[PDB]
Amino acid sequence: QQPLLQAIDLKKHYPVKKGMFAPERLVKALDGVSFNLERGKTLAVVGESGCGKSTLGRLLTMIEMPTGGELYYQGQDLLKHDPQAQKLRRQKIQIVFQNPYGSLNPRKKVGQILEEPLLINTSLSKEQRREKALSMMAKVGLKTEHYDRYPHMFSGGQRQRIAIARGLMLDPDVVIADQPVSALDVSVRAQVLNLMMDLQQELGLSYVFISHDLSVVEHIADEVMVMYLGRCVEKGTKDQIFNNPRHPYTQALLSATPRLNPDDRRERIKLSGELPSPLNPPPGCAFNARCRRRFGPCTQLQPQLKDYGGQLVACFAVDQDE
Template structure:
């Protein structure tokens, strides 16, 4: 059995909302006791409609927000960010890639500085080594050292998302939280970025939490799927189980309302990858 990298136990998130003109406030529970485990090298997809709580859960997993209740464990260690920010050792284990490749990069910073910034903040790596690592990571994501001194506006959306992925990998994390990472991209570019994520997962042994509303994408990248509705995990199982025989009415309704996208290129690429992994394991 593979090691469990990430575990959530009865995670709860409450928000206090103002009562408006008449004053007062009320509490809205966005997450209502979520449980899950993710094994090393696997991809858990979190699926749900807008407002279901999936992005709230992603922010907790990425150590951005503290849960109101429950426990989050990374590599078996309980994470408590309610009183203080996680230290560099814990922070380096988890990184996040956001949905919007246009808004997630500082337009005033050259790409090289964007990539080196995590090393500057969290490590004492010398300047020359920081640059060498940044240039090497650009190559890993399909760009090159010649892009080091360029600004974000000089890149396409797909290239910017590659840069965001490169930045997330600079601290050698074991877990990436990917919040709708391809939803802002054209279909052909989506396939390229998904193939890149698959290659990086194989090369670095990464574990992914993949938040998405696009079931066509989820079907071909996920190992396990958790369906969230109104802050509750209504269904959780392997990708094949959930897609072939959804148990909960909400899951069936979600599938019925989602158009099937032609992702044959993604299907073929990831099918080959999974077959190779299965043959290697055998």
């Protein structure tokens, strides 16, 4: 049987113009890669700020069409319309937005935002939708007084939780979680992550979990994917990546994570050299300008994912070591 989600070589590129009559340049926001996602499983996505993760999340959610590659849900092509399927496929794949304030309609109350998923997709009467909305709000540490509020009369970590509540509402098969816990304190983060893990165990809900906080990914993930400059650089099980990181971007990334105990604290790699541009990405390996393991092929050829014991790594120095 096919995976619950299966991406193959997904690309997305954005037009940019310096002025209304200027030449239309192309931003390489995702020159991306395949993945398989199975039921009851979490795939975390980690990497540089601006490296394409939210762009990937928009493709998987069907917010945008890709500029290339394929996207299957359960063996059904998501990139062509089918009216008998699309009503079900729409409720079965859902998102938690990054910076979710702009994703909450300012002229709506939080109860209306959380009931809308139910009102479109279910038979639930008014009292049963209010019951579901308040029940989901309670499970993220909101309150019956918040159901009546407009989205600007909250803190950012409460807007995160309104976006989580809306995403988890439907019993979906996949949730694309775009920075879902970053504006939460560690006690509310623990409550939300415990809810996401309880739903993964009870419902079979899978996650694509986009996070910059590595301490959370080291806990919730089952597979982890590392991204740089629109492309994937390493993929494996969570033990493989956190115990033996092989791509020198992953080594520099995992090395910079803050840790509360003073002893545990270590010097970051202090990557030095010009950053690569999404408008003209360098020939060959994207990281070459800042990489410590410099070697001949890197400035010339595009590296690709090789197996090395199920740990997919896209690096010529790891190929030379092997």
